[model samples]
Target: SPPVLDLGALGQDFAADPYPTYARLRAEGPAHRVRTPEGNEVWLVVGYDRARAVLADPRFSKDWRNSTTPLTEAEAALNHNMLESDPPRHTRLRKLVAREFTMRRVELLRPRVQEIVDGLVDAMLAAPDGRADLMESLAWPLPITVISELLGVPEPDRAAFRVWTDAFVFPDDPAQAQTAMAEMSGYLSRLIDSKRGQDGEDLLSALVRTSDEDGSRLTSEELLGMAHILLVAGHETTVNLIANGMYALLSHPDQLAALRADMTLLDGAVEEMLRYEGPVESATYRFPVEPVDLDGTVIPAGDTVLVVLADAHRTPERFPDPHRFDIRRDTAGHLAFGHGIHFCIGAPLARLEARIAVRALLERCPDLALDVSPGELVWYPNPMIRGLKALPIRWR
Candidate 1:
């Protein structure tokens, strides 16, 4: 019999600070049966090696089509994305996007990213009493603006998209998700239709051109799915990366002092931020196509398995003194961007945005300090997105 842990019982305490619970779980073994707040029993995989093995293993399918599970219309439509698919289909879909979303393209956005950060910070500095919710002023707007511009979402359309994304990602009411999904899909369909034959430099138009070149290369549904995934994945995690990195630095005076002393540490500090409190707490659900053994724990076929990226990063065997936040530590092989074929395609873009955002903020606000006690901080209830509800700060 497997030990069952109820995550709901932990409540807001778990949401605000999950590391202690994760550490306790890791103490026992690499895998355990846990019931999520959503009331689903899942096999939570911890420890670096076991998490990597589970992520790289082909038997753990990302597709729900292979399972007996039922999905709503919204879920069904969104599940067509690459993150939820296995190889061949995933391979082909990834190739289409990667061909367009190149590193060179991300590099080109550095100036624009810096400009956006500067504009947001300017407003932040001008705030009354020198205090502002950093999330409101800087963290949220920068990535959404960058991604919207990248996808060629008209400036007018961005507000609606932002509302829809917020509702989807940080739902105050869970029932609104289905409506938001339909609204977004409908909006994308129209956008796709408008871009059908026009030649535009934006990523979306380029994808439409690719589909037009060869009908079979990218299907209509695939086009919608890709646009949906790119829109959400492109910004959501990056928002968390900026927010969480700032929060991590603000809370750790020593780390902040070290980083402030040398801006050259920006790159490695960003990596350490990623390793310390990454954007993703856990990966999307993965199902086993067949019984798979992960470090002596056998998960029966079709059972839901969640690779806890947050815990895996803190595995003592892999990262010595795992609890400590050291920006200079070698953070190679961290799964913050994930592992295997489903690795985040927007990593370069995200890294660029984060580096620019963090450096600019620190440079501008030399006296930055957290407005609220760290323990008083509240987090989003959604485990997949590990970000603060609000990061209030004041600076001289």
Candidate 2:
């Protein structure tokens, strides 16, 4: 049996900075059986090579439905989406929605994204003394507004999703989240039905009307699953990407200046932001569908796995001076959006939005700075995500 560190007993250390633990794990070997902070057991994939391999391997299944372990009703409800299905099912799920996310389709949204950024920055400037939580004012709203429009989700129906998704994604108590999960599922199911009669320019309508040339479309069940994942994953990743990326800039003055000096570096800066503090700390869970040999250590079939993506980004072998925040660093092949067939379908859209939002803010404000001390920043407790709870900034 491998070592099972009791994470439940270890509190803030894991929450604040888990990289040290990941480093220790990598020093040991890529795979280790560890207990999660939530008191669950899982096989953690550490290091860049190992993390990438496990993430791309077909043997490590994303299909949570096959797990022998029992999940809470809320947990189970959240897994019926693309991130949690295997090929044929996963392939079909992705095919229905991927068309709407291609680079060209996303480019069409750029102008709309700019409008939101301008309008939101206007609101941010309206804040007393030019101070506001970027997470609330810019980061959170831009992607939410863009994605809402894309899906044809009514603005009124938008905020409810944040609450519902939180209850599903990060819950303090399983029972309450279970109720919210069922409610969210019910609401999305109803919403899709309401969209059925429309001309269908929106992404959701596209999915509803989109056929694979065989004249087949997503089933009602699959549609709800896609909607659930899209609504949550779509905006959440970018929210953190913007907020955290901005935080990185405000905190590091030299790097911030370099970025502002060369506006062309904006693209490179966005890539670095993703590499430095990617929105997701780890990829979603994968389990060996069968007993698998991972670098000579064998994992039994159906065991839960996690690839520490943030740690992989900083792997010294892959990135020299891995901890430094250099915008010029070659960020190609970074696992920030993941790798292989499951690469983030929203990568291009996210990069575009972040680039625009970051550039617009820096140009408009020109003097953005953190409103609080570094240690004062509170981050979300969810290990799967690397994000601050709020990013308060002040500009002159």
Candidate 3:
């Protein structure tokens, strides 16, 4: 047995500043056996080259069925989506979703997305004290609202959806996480049924119709899985993108000034944001289908693997002066949106939302700055995500 690093024992501080710990691990080797804060002991992969290689490697399976580790009932229920399956199943899922979620389709939503961002910014500006938690006022609302509307979720149900997702993502208590997952699954099942035989313009309705016409194309269980994943994954990743990107900017005044001075820098700044402090800390778990050697270390067949994307982007070998936050630097191959076939299908939509949200806030409120010191900020303790619980901002 390899030496085990108990991340759960490291606790809150590690979650707040995991980069240094990851760097230390990378210094020793690219892979190690460790217990995650979630209490799963597995091989953790760090460093740029190894992480990228592992992400694209077929030896690692996404489906939990191949793993020796046990999964919760909730995990079993939500594992049928694209990100959780191997090829054939994953290929089919991606093809169906990609057909509907095209770059052109996302592009068409730009006007509506912009409209949503404008309303959120307008609300932020209307605050009495010229200060508000940006995470709550803008970052969280924009993505959730846009995604919910695209999926045709009722306005009244949106708050409940948000609450459920928070539980599913953070899961401080296992029982609570299970409850949230079950509730979300129940809600999605009912919502999918309601969409059946309806002419609704939402994505869910279209998918439901597609499945109805040809069950061979998409089974009923697959339809439920698709809806569940889209509803949860759609907004959570983007929510952190907006929040983390804004926090990065506010922390680096020089970079903030450069972007404000040249609005053209917005694109680079967004990429840099994804590279520097991307939303996802680690990619979802992968298990080896057979014993695999990562460098000299041989991981047993059926053991879990986690690729630390946060560490990959910070590898000094891949990115020169990796710790420095330079929006002008070349950020071409950053794994923030991930790499390989499992890459984020919603990448275009996420980039557009971040660009619009960040640009609108900067243009409208020239004085926008952090209301609280960066060191005082509290990040979510979830190992899989890198996001602040709240980001307070103030402007004239």
**Candidate that scores best on lDDT:** 3
Pairs with steric clashes in candidate 1: none
Top TM-score prediction, candidate number? 3
The order of the candidates by TM-score, greatest first, is 3, 1, 2
Write down the lDDT that model 2 would get.
0.81
lDDT of 3 by residue, 8-85 (tens): 788778878999988999998888998777766778899999999999999999988898988787667767788889
* Clash counts for all predictions: 0, 0, 0
Clash pairs detected, candidate 3 = none
Give the per-residue lDDT digits (tens) of candidate 2, residues 1-396: 564675546676666677787787788777888777666678788899888988889988888765767777655655767888888888877887687789998898888888888998888888878788888788878888888888888889888876776664457776766888788777877777777767778777766665322344566556677887888888789888998898888889999989888899999999999998888898988878789887787878888888999889879999999888989999998999899888899888999899999998888887789999988887666668887777888987
Report the number of backbone clashes for model 1: 0
Candidate 2 lands at a TM-score of: 0.94
TM-score computed on alpha carbons, candidate 1: 0.96
After superposition, candidate 2 runs with Cα above 4 Å error:
1-3, 71-78, 210-216
The superposed Cα distance between candidate 2 and the true structure at residue 24, in angstroms, equals 1.2
lDDT of 1 at 210: 81
TM-score of each: 0.96, 0.94, 0.97
